[PDB]
Design a binder for this molecule. Structure first.
Ligand SMILES: CC[C@@H]1CN(S(=O)(=O)N(C)C)CCO1
Ligand SMILES: [Zn+2]
Length: 140
């Protein structure tokens, strides 16, 4: 579990979004595994605006943050998980690291701020849903 709190937005994995998220929906995309809802209180996070390929992510199933190199966001085949079928997912980056289903929502960060959240795992990789292209998160 986990979210990004930027401005008056909450960014969560689409598959973990709550009823309140859907009732306060700003934007969602199944292909990216993302959903954004509106918040009453402003949030503490800053979104990275960059093309870094190195950062640090939080792994809840290890209680640890790990430094990683990661691929640029792309369209990637993802094998079946407990929460999605095998399918293509867009806006995805990959690193070598540990990720189980409940690690989704852990932040990946670089020197510029939050890059994305854990969204995929298995076979010794961790996949992150990018948010650095969502420039509208920084306003309004
Ligand atoms: C040639 C396909 C893809 C699309 N991606 S993407 O935006 O990250 N996304 C999956 C749409 C970037 C690289 O090229
Ligand atoms: Zn960066």
């Amino acid at each position: 579990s986990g979210a990004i709190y930027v401005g008056n937005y909450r960014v969560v994995n689409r598959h973990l979004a709550t009823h309140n998220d859907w009732a306060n929906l700003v934007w969602e995309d199944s292909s990216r595994d993302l959903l954004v809802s509106s918040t009453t209180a402003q949030g503490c996070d800053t979104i990275a605006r960059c093309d870094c390929q190195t950062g640090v992510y939080y792994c809840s199933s290890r209680r640890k943050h790990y430094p990683v190199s990661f691929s640029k966001p792309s369209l990637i085949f993802v094998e079946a998980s407990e929460y999605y079928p095998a399918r293509y997912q867009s806006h995805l980056m990959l690193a070598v690291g540990h990720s189980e289903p409940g690690d989704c929502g852990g932040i990946l960060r670089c020197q510029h701020g939050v890059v994305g959240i854990v969204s995929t795992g298995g076979n010794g990789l961790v996949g992150f849903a990018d948010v650095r292209d969502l420039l509208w998160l920084d306003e309004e």
